[PDB]
Every structure is written in structure tokens, then in C-alpha cells.
């Protein structure tokens, strides 16, 4: 929890740095608007979910 | 000084604010690649 | 040959990095007041 958390939050960041460079190139290259569409929903719920995760997580280490 | 459990990130917290600016910056990089 | 913009931005960051150094350098730099 105190240990689990720090990997949980640091995940959310390597996922956002990812999520970021992602969508940009995505809407840009419409060749894979059809496949990357999912590489965009990949992080999304996992991102939102990863945030709500840091959720109950922070009200637990401090 | 952020909550104790965040100690690890003072480094980023440190930069986050520069970004805003960063955008007017990039706006140029693209305009340059796109020959105006 | 090498794209023109790509030389500008990397040339630029240097000015923005070198210049940035100079501002730090005024805080610990000899010329600080400490």
C-alpha cells in the first residue's frame, strides 16, 4: 500500500507521457484511426482507472 | 514540501509549471515544419 | 539535405539552454550577493 502506491502513481505518469505522445500522432496519422483508436482507449480507462486508483491509495499513506 | 508520500516527485512538481509556456513554443516548431 | 526546422529547434534550445544557464549562474554565480 505504502510500497504498492509509489509504483501505482509512477505508472500513471509513464502511462500519461505515453498517452500524450499517442493521441497526437494518432489524429495526425489517420491511416490507423481504425486500429490506434484502441491504443487511445487502452490508456484511457486504464488512465482514469489508474487515477481513481491513486484515489483510495493516497488517503492511505499520508 | 508536498505530502510525505510524494517525496519522490519534488523534481517533477518542480517543472510542471513551465509547460503552459512550452505550448506557444511548440506552436512555432510546427509552423516551421509546415513552411508557413 | 537535413530538414531546416530540425536544425532551428535544436539550435534554438541551445540558446534557451545556454541562456537559461546564465540565469541560474546569476544566482550562485560569483555575481550573487553571498
Amino acid at each position: 500500500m505504502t510500497i504498492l502506491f509509489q509504483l501505482a502513481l509512477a505508472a500513471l505518469v509513464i502511462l500519461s507521457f505515453v498517452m500524450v505522445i499517442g493521441v497526437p500522432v494518432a489524429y495526425a496519422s489517420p491511416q490507423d484511426w481504425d486500429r490506434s483508436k484502441q491504443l487511445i482507449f487502452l490508456g484511457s480507462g486504464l488512465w482514469i482507472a489508474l487515477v481513481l486508483v491513486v484515489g483510495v491509495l493516497n488517503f492511505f499513506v499520508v | 514540501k508536498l505530502p510525505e508520500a510524494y517525496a519522490i516527485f519534488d523534481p517533477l512538481v518542480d517543472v510542471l509549471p513551465v509547460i503552459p509556456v512550452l505550448f506557444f513554443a511548440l506552436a512555432f516548431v510546427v509552423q516551421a515544419a509546415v513552411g508557413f | 539535405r537535413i530538414p531546416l526546422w530540425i536544425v532551428a529547434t535544436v539550435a534554438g534550445m541551445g540558446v534557451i539552454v545556454i541562456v537559461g544557464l546564465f540565469f541560474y549562474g546569476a544566482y550562485a554565480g560569483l555575481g550573487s550577493s553571498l
Binding site: A28 | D14 | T9
Partner: peptide, 28 residues
């Protein structure tokens, strides 16, 4: 201390999108 290296990546995050866009195509 470290602060600097981690700022570096974010800063070059933007021109990288321009690059990843140069190679692929679109935008235009």
C-alpha cells in the same frame, strides 16, 4: 536534485510529436 533530467524528456516530448508526424504523414 535529479529535477533536471526528468524535465529534459518532457521538453523534447513536443518536437518528437512533430518528428513522429513527419515520418508517418498527415496533418496536411
Amino acid at each position: 536534485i535529479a529535477q533536471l533530467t526528468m524535465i529534459a524528456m518532457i521538453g523534447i516530448a513536443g518536437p518528437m510529436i512533430i518528428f513522429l508526424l513527419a515520418v508517418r504523414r498527415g496533418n496536411l
